[PDB]
Design a protein around this ligand. Structure first.
Ligand SMILES: [Mg+2]
Ligand SMILES: [Mg+2]
Ligand SMILES: [Mg+2]
Ligand SMILES: [Mg+2]
Ligand SMILES: [Mg+2]
Ligand SMILES: [Mg+2]
Ligand SMILES: [Mg+2]
Ligand SMILES: [Mg+2]
Ligand SMILES: [Mg+2]
Ligand SMILES: [Mg+2]
Ligand SMILES: [Mg+2]
Ligand SMILES: [Mg+2]
Ligand SMILES: [Mg+2]
Ligand SMILES: [Mg+2]
Ligand SMILES: [Mg+2]
Ligand SMILES: [Mg+2]
Ligand SMILES: [Mg+2]
Ligand SMILES: [Mg+2]
Ligand SMILES: [Mg+2]
Ligand SMILES: [Mg+2]
Ligand SMILES: [Mg+2]
Ligand SMILES: [Mg+2]
Ligand SMILES: [Mg+2]
Ligand SMILES: [Mg+2]
Ligand SMILES: [Mg+2]
Ligand SMILES: [Mg+2]
Ligand SMILES: [Mg+2]
Ligand SMILES: [Mg+2]
Ligand SMILES: [Mg+2]
Ligand SMILES: [Mg+2]
Ligand SMILES: [Mg+2]
Ligand SMILES: [Mg+2]
Ligand SMILES: [Mg+2]
Ligand SMILES: [Mg+2]
Ligand SMILES: [Zn+2]
Lengths: 69, 84, 123, 23, 181, 69
RNA sequence: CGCCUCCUAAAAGGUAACGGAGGCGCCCAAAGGUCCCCUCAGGCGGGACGGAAAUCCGCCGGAGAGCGCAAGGGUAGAAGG
RNA sequence: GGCGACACACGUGCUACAAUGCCCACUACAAAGCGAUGCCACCCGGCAACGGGGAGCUAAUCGCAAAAAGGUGGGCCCAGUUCGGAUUGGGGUCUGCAACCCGACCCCAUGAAGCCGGAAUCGCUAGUAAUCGCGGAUCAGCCAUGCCGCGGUGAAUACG
RNA sequence: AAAUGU
RNA sequence: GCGGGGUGGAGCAGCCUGGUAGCUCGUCGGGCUCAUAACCCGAAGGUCGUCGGUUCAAAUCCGGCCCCCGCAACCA
């Protein structure tokens, strides 16, 4: 590699808000990150954040079964 | 919309038809004047001809259009465009 | 990109900064601060990341917001045009949906005014 | 403003009550 | 070299699963990563703001590698372009720096992507290579909102010795590439 | 007679000095069987054209027939 | 009306007509000398903004590209970058 | 079913573009008028619209009813904003046979144009203009921001 | 200064 | 034969010197007036005759076709 033009790659700690810590390399020694692959809705299983809502519509509607017969 | 504590409004005379078909024999042409009527789960699979003021609109009924009313699916005004 | 995906404005009260998230009005804003025990009167710039991720956790999970929110909103409108009911039609033509008068106004839904060589008066 | 229903002011104007102007 | 997460995971977890999956007769036949080339389309720096060495600095923080410039091969009237103008940055990541980057990419970067529903399962070369598009760059951990001046996306090409799309899919899957369908 | 149906206008707009003259008429004339003759439609909506100027617009198309193409 | 390229020109050279078609009267301080490295047009697939065409990747591609400017000859085993 | 249409054009209007403002808490001073399948206090359920009970009053007796601007206090700090409330999604309430056309209201999310308006043009000479709320007739309900009334605060200028 | 009217 | 030209609806710029179409009238929407014209405010419209070349790029440079204007066709 060329001398004098490249940034130093030092051992680096990336820390997330879920507690997961990444042992990696970067140009910044410590970095905190709001989200990671260990706590992200797509990655972490069928974590459907809130969205079971969902494909209920239309005829789970009921309420109820009260027409004259 | 109408209150939920009150009854989900069908027109009785229309609903009788829907149910009288799922026994005897489905299906046919169910010419109606009840745009007021909410589409009931038992209407699914049918084809109701809905009035628009002049003519009966052939309307298939799918699963994802239940809570609505007939009249939505038979428009009353014709536009196509302007200065065209 | 803190909460949720957006970086809520510093130097401003948290009950206000929260509103700048898609899915949060003045209501949910004040809620998720008493429900998480943060004085809404504090500036975002003066927070411990604890308070953040605590507030972040609550907010990002209680209601679906921003992107998936826009999807679900879009999908509903999408579904309406599919059937298509009258409410669905007036979305296709980009006309008022909640049965407003169109003969005048309705400009929020019809974009800018498109004047035209209409009828002429007399000589 | 007088048209914002989400205000004490706005609900006064219309002439109704609620969360933002209760009785 | 050194020891890094993804690079270890490749040799003691990925390679065998691949051998098992496809039954290779040779150690060298099994899919390797060759290189990861980052390209920043730019050209917003054609004449406008002439020099964007801020993208050069940002990319240098992301990869630990100072990117090379790409200049217009030929002049184009419609794009207001003169033959020879700086209109892009390209950096070529190989070996450890390729891993180090790809690790932070899969472990941290792709997560931060707004409305991330998974990578595209069709963006495969047809000859066993993959390309993807990033539209922002604060996605990366070393980059924040403070140090940025404008939003700048990029093009990532991951090049592998898989002869087929199928073989390549596996290699990326096992390494930790999310896929919508 | 005509070998095809059509649709044109009739504008008479003289703006020199408030003296007068302003007649506007659009029509859709279409061919007929070779034994009919002449049939005129008063297809005017509301007051778009006054009803007092109707004898003298019938009399205007009328007068045009006498000499042909 | 002088000059250059092609054809006419009958396979050496040359060869006429108020015969058939083009161009020149400049240019470059690098577009020069040398050493060193590099290889095109185009086609298919892939890729944020980014399009038919900007930049990146893969595969096919002996030269159909390029050689400031006409045409011819030459030419990557370089005269091209 | 339509009179509610929508490429567009004019009239009358309502709400605004903000700090003489906007928001929230508490705290005051009107007037005219209406009210027996009516006004409905007071309590309970509900963030609420409202619902469940339930006292009174043929009403200078009881109810609508809180007037609003204002007053004290705190927040916002000049931003398309805690300005702005259009637009759309979603869940509801009430009336009525029934709310798709085509009701109003409540709540969550949404948060558009608009930074004071070209040529032009309207009203008003005093408790007037401006501004703030209240009532009523029509009336199941309501598209009233319209109309007819009532009071609060309360200016400027008129050489000619 | 400033035209015209079946 | 020689020279010039063809561009919003009309009449004219830009052309040489390549990158940008402009001026007056007209048309359309809005004002003024009882009304009309004048007059005031604002808009819309050319894809540069047409095919090919050159060029990164052509109304503009070159060429071919098609129209038009002027001049010339003398000794005979
Ligand atoms: Mg918000
Ligand atoms: Mg309405
Ligand atoms: Mg006001
Ligand atoms: Mg594919
Ligand atoms: Mg490969
Ligand atoms: Mg010879
Ligand atoms: Mg010789
Ligand atoms: Mg040279
Ligand atoms: Mg050379
Ligand atoms: Mg190529
Ligand atoms: Mg391609
Ligand atoms: Mg760009
Ligand atoms: Mg060649
Ligand atoms: Mg040349
Ligand atoms: Mg009407
Ligand atoms: Mg301001
Ligand atoms: Mg905004
Ligand atoms: Mg604006
Ligand atoms: Mg706001
Ligand atoms: Mg507001
Ligand atoms: Mg709704
Ligand atoms: Mg209705
Ligand atoms: Mg003002
Ligand atoms: Mg105004
Ligand atoms: Mg007076
Ligand atoms: Mg009132
Ligand atoms: Mg109004
Ligand atoms: Mg005069
Ligand atoms: Mg012209
Ligand atoms: Mg012309
Ligand atoms: Mg006039
Ligand atoms: Mg051409
Ligand atoms: Mg051209
Ligand atoms: Mg040009
Ligand atoms: Zn995490």
């Amino acid at each position: 590699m060329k001398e004098g033009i490249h940034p130093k790659l030092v051992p680096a700690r990336i820390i997330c808000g879920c507690g997961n810590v990444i042992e990696t390399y970067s140009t910044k020694p410590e970095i905190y990150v709001e989200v990671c692959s260990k706590c992200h809705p797509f990655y972490t299983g069928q974590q459907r954040f809130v969205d079971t809502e969902g494909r209920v519509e239309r005829f789970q509607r009921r309420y109820g079964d009260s027409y004259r017969k | 919309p109408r209150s939920l504590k009150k009854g989900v409004f069908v027109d009785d005379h229309l609903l009788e038809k829907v149910l009288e078909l799922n026994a005897k024999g489905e299906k046919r042409l169910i010419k109606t004047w009840s745009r007021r009527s909410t589409i009931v789960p038992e209407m699914v699979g049918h084809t109701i001809a809905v009035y628009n003021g002049k003519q009966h609109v052939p309307v298939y009924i799918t699963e994802n259009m239940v809570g609505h009313k007939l009249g939505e699916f038979a428009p009353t005004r014709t536009y196509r465009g302007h200065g065209k | 990109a803190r909460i949720a995906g957006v970086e809520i404005p510093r130097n401003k009260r948290v009950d206000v900064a929260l509103t700048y998230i898609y899915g949060i009005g003045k209501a949910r804003a004040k809620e998720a601060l008493e429900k998480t025990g943060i004085n809404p009167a504090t500036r975002v710039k003066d927070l411990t990341e604890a308070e953040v991720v605590r507030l972040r956790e609550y907010v990002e999970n209680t209601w679906k917001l921003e992107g998936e929110l826009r999807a679900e909103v879009a999908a509903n409108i999408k579904r309406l045009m599919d059937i298509g009911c009258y409410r669905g039609l007036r979305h296709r033509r980009g006309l008022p949906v909640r049965g407003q008068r169109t003969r005048t106004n309705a400009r929020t839904r019809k974009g800018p005014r498109k004047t035209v060589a209409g009828k002429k008066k007399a000589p | 403003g007088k048209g914002d229903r989400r205000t004490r002011r706005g609900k006064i104007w219309r002439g109704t009550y609620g969360k933002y102007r209760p009785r | 070299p050194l020891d890094v997460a993804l690079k270890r995971k490749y040799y003691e977890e990925v390679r065998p699963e691949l051998i098992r999956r496809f039954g290779y007769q040779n150690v060298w036949e099994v899919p390797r990563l060759e290189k990861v080339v980052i390209n920043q389309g730019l050209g917003e720096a054609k004449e406008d703001a002439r020099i964007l060495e801020k993208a050069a600095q940002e990319l240098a923080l992301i990869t630990g590698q100072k990117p090379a410039v790409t200049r217009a091969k030929k002049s184009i009237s419609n794009f207001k372009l003169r033959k020879g103008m700086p209109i892009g940055l390209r950096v070529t990541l190989r070996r450890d720096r390729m891993w180090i980057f790809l690790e932070k990419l899969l472990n941290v970067a792709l997560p931060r992507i707004r409305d991330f529903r998974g990578l595209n399962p069709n963006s495969f070369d047809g000859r066993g290579n993959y390309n993807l598009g990033l539209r922002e760059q604060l996605i990366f951990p070393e980059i924040t909102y403070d140090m940025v001046d404008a939003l700048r996306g990029m093009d990532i090409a991951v090049v592998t010795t898989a002869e087929t799309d199928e073989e390549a899919r596996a290699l990326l899957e096992l390494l930790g590439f999310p896929f919508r369908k | 007679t005509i070998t095809k149906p059509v649709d044109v206008e009739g504008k008479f707009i003289r703006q020199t000095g408030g003296r007068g003259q302003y007649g506007h008429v659009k029509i859709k004339v279409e061919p007929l069987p070779r034994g009919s003759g002449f049939e005129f439609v008063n297809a005017i909506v509301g007051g778009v054209i006054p009803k007092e100027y109707i004898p003298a617009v019938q009399k205007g198309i009328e007068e045009a027939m006498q000499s042909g193409p």
